[PDB]
């Protein structure tokens, strides 16, 4: 396009300026208050309490046959299972290995017997089953079962009677007030009750002639054929069968709290009304508030204090001891999520449940924006503090520079062209506005002085007003730059957008600007920003999947047998 | 019936020892705890211990828990108190009495015997 | 160590009429029994289970009772009851009696 031009007109003393001064630098107060110390994080204990205890109970088979002309149908067979009563399991079972054959029991409110194959009682040993792999023991007395025929246009009578005891795994849940068995067998009591050291209060159903407490109960291993160590057992006679178990007190057994994830070097921080609980080595953060939490407000946490202890000496001996010291007793916080932090510090040498969340992704996150969170911070409170002391060290070059060129470096910071005097201790501006078009700009041939040889000028004369060429498109009114006048003088000029090359006092040629080459005063810098993400819903396994793992499915198998009648038989007609 | 067949009266020096029988008879005797108790003269009454005569399992009232040791003939079926090391405040009427062996609501001392009394003089 | 304060001390009682008698515990039993003593003889077993009567005792004899609390009321006081009528317990290690009560005829 058209090149630019400047004037500057003689300069007013009107306008008056001065350096800044030096601006403060600003300290971010950046540092935690921290403590380092161990913790032992506890969850809520959802697993049901699992013990072992031991079913008693006979089996009595009444078939009723019925033999026809040339062969033998079974008109009925009435199944049941009835208890062995305790009476017969400390004098028969235990004392020797043997059951009775007959089965005495109450049915529909009276008291009746049944014989095994209708003869004189026995005492029959116990035998092992066959399929007594370990984790499921079982004894019975008779592989076989009776039923006889008779002549035939008869009916007939068979009664099997077969001694039964059982290994089993019991189980129970909160609030622990009934167990079912592995025989999917429910007992309407808490396996903690028993008559004794206040365990009445616990929950019952059954009449209290049901149930018997013995104490250094010998009870005898039928397969070894001898008595195990003395422990107190409980006996319970249900419509069915009867229940055997090895009393424990509920203290010692059932707790709401269990072991997550011992800790060996947190860090407890202090926000505003929060700790925060780094635990670096599982990238994890906890947060609670600054309150203790007493651990009596929530139902059986007995065993959450002390066995810390035991964790927290452990480690404080084999990685604490000669490098730090204890600062006190352990502290209890209640995390945000439903965990529990016991904590105890250290130093340098210088009621209700709590329900736990199923992910702690939630706190790993907390953990790595903090992680960041902390470190950018960090950097960046250092550029702002390095940057300012650059910027205050470079002052002193700009006021030690201002007395050599003063219109060309307060041209740069008002971005504008003026021009600046030095009035002593200040800058006095005026500004240089742009020469418009139609003028005649007709460059000299010689810079020498008419007449005078020894004198000539510094840069070139112009025509528009006979003036001279100033720097940067300036053109000074005046021809008053003048120096003495030396041989081998070969300048350049900055004209237009052409460097006009003198030699000698005296026009050469031009040359274009891009044909100059360049030297470059900038530092480069590509800092380049960071790209957008889309995070998908990604799940290893959908919930299809996690319901699909069983054998069977109880809700599956009732929809197709509870249908049977109505599938395989027709319902609706009736008979007259 | 069931009778409590008891070693009855005594004197005794002081720092020496005793050995009071309980013998049984109308009953079974391997299956029945039986207990002792101490009744002071004209105070109340004090549970001691018992002894499983089938197991040899003991419980004590451990404010007796030195005094008094227990065991069992199993020939002619009795039980023994033995004391040891004596002194003047148990001069006092002792018992025994049957008790089950189950802790059921069914269990209590259902048969008591006569009465031992022992004094403790010079 | 479990306490049983049978609160009456001696409960006088003109032959004919009901009374009232009360095991009171420190801390709960399941079950207080009871038992009584004419002097210079043997304890007897009196009552098992807290309300149930003995084999052998007459009908009037009635005893209450749960928790902490335990009552023994004669529906009509005979003067053939002049005992010493202890309550017990088994509940807690060791077993331990009441301080007795003795009743009285008004004659």
């Known amino acids: 396009t058209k090149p630019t031009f400047y004037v500057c007109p003689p300069p007013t003393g009107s306008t008056i300026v001065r350096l800044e001064p030096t601006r403060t630098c600003p300290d971010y107060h950046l540092g935690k208050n921290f403590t380092e110390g161990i913790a032992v994080v506890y969850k809520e204990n959802i697993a049901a309490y699992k013990f072992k205890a031991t079913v008693y109970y006979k089996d009595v088979i009444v078939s009723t046959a019925w033999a026809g002309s040339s062969y033998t149908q079974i008109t009925n067979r009435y199944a049941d299972r009835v208890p062995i009563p305790v009476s017969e399991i400390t004098d028969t079972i235990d004392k020797f290995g043997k059951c009775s054959s007959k089965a005495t029991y109450v049915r529909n409110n009276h008291k009746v017997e049944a014989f095994n194959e209708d003869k004189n009682p026995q005492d029959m040993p116990l035998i092992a089953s066959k399929y007594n792999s370990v984790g499921s023991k079982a004894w019975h007395t008779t592989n076989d079962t009776y039923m006889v025929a008779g002549t035939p246009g008869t009916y007939r009578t068979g009664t099997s009677v077969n001694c039964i005891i059982e290994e089993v795994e019991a189980r129970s849940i909160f609030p622990y007030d009934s167990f079912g068995l592995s025989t999917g067998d429910i007992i309407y009591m808490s396996p903690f009750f028993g008559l004794r050291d206040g365990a009445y209060r616990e929950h019952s159903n059954y009449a209290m002639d049901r149930f018997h407490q013995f104490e250094g109960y010998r009870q005898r291993d039928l397969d070894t054929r001898a008595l195990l160590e003395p422990a107190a057992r409980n006996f319970l006679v249900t419509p069915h069968l009867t229940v055997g178990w090895n009393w424990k007190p509920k203290r010692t057994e059932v707790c709401s709290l269990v072991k997550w994830r011992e800790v060996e070097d947190v860090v407890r921080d202090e926000y505003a009304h929060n700790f925060r609980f780094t635990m670096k080595t599982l990238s994890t953060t906890f947060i609670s508030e600054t309150n203790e939490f007493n651990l009596n407000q929530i139902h059986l946490s007995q065993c959450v204090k002390e066995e810390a202890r035991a964790i927290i000496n452990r480690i404080y001996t084999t990685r604490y001891n000669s490098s730090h010291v204890r600062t006190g007793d352990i502290q209890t916080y209640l995390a945000r999520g439903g965990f529990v932090v016991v904590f105890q510090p250290l130093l340098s040498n210088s009621n209700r449940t709590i329900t736990t969340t199923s992910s702690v992704e939630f706190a790993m996150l907390q953990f790595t924006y903090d992680h960041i969170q902390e470190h950018v911070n960090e950097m960046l409170a250092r550029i702002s503090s390095s940057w300012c002391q650059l910027q205050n060290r470079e002052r002193a070059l700009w006021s030690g520079l201002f007395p050599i060129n003063p219109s060309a470096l307060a041209s740069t910071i008002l971005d504008q062209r003026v021009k600046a005097r030095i009035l002593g201790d200040v800058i006095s501006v005026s500004n240089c506005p742009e020469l418009g078009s139609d003028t005649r700009i007709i460059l000299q041939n010689s810079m020498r002085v008419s007449g005078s040889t020894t004198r000539c000028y510094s840069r070139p004369l112009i025509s528009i007003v006979e003036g001279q060429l100033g720097t940067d498109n300036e053109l000074i009114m005046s021809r008053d730059l003048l120096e003495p006048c030396v041989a081998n003088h070969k300048r350049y000029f900055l004209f237009g957008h052409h460097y006009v090359y003198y030699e000698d006092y005296r026009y050469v040629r031009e040359i274009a600007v891009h044909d100059v080459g360049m030297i470059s005063t900038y530092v480069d810098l590509n800092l380049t920003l960071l790209k957008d993400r889309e995070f998908m819903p990604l799940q290893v396994y959908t919930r299809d999947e996690l319901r699909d793992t069983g054998l069977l499915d109880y809700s599956e198998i009732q929809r197709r047998n509870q249908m049977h009648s109505l599938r395989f038989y027709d319902i609706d007609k009736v008979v007259q | 019936e069931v009778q409590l067949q008891q070693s009855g009266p005594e004197l005794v020096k002081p720092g020496a020892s005793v050995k009071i029988s309980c013998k049984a008879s109308g009953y079974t005797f391997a299956d029945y705890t039986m207990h002792w108790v101490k009744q002071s003269h004209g105070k109340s009454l004090e549970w001691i211990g018992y002894?499983?005569?089938?197991?040899?399992?003991?419980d004590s009232n451990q404010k007796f828990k030195n005094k008094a040791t227990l065991t069992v003939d199993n020939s002619s079926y009795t039980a023994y108190m033995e004391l040891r090391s004596l002194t003047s405040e148990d001069s006092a009427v002792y018992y025994c009495?049957?008790?089950?062996?189950?802790?059921?609501?069914?269990?209590?001392?259902?048969?008591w015997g006569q009465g031992t009394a022992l004094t403790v003089s010079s | 160590q479990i306490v049983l304060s049978q609160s009456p001390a001696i409960l006088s009682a003109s032959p004919g009429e009901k009374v009232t008698m009360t095991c009171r515990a420190s801390?709960?039993?399941?079950?207080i029994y009871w038992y009584q003593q004419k002097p210079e003889s043997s304890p007897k077993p009196w009552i098992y289970?807290?309300?149930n009567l003995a084999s052998g005792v007459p009908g009037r004899f009635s005893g209450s009772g749960s928790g902490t609390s335990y009552s023994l009321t004669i529906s009509r006081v005979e003067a053939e009851d002049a005992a010493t009528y202890y309550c017990?317990?088994?509940?807690?290690?060791?077993?331990?009696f009441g301080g007795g009560t003795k009743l009285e005829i008004r004659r």
């Open positions: 017990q317990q088994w509940s807690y290690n060791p077993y331990t």
């Open positions: 009495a049957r008790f089950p062996p189950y802790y059921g609501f069914d269990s209590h001392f259902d048969y």
């Open positions: 801390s709960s039993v399941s079950y």
């Open positions: 289970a807290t309300s």
């Open positions: 002894i499983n005569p089938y197991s040899l399992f003991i």
